[PDB]
Design a protein around this ligand. Structure first.
Ligand code: NA
Length: 91
DNA sequence: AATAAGCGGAAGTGGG
DNA sequence: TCCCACTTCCGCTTA
């Protein structure tokens, strides 16, 4: 199954949920979630995964934080903002 | 208080 | 066996 970071990168490339997520500086890989519309995107992630429970932004962000150590996605010190690694962007 | 984002330890689930 | 890649639950912190 698709990994969370790839799900997000694919959404940003397709523009299918542009009211829930958007690039801040695509060259740097920085992106931001919508305060009011992020839950719809979280719901889609859980359904794509076939998880038992409804997915929430809190649980999705809990998973995102685990990428901090390996580097695929890091939290930026701006509201709802994160950054993909160069390696993720290149693939 | 109400609302919201952010955090992570711990235990559970999936598919190797 | 035992790690993958999260998921779920819970309690806490800061603004
Ligand atoms: Na929030």
């Amino acid at each position: 199954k698709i990994r969370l970071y790839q799900f997000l990168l694919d959404l940003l490339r397709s523009g299918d949920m542009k009211d829930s997520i958007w690039w801040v500086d695509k060259d740097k890989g920085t992106f931001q979630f919508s305060s009011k519309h992020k839950e719809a995107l979280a719901h889609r992630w859980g359904i794509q995964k076939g998880n038992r429970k409804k997915m929430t932004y809190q649980k999705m962000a809990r998973a995102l934080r685990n990428y901090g150590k390996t580097g695929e996605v890091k939290k930026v010190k701006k509201k709802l903002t994160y950054q993909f690694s160069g390696e993720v962007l290149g693939r």
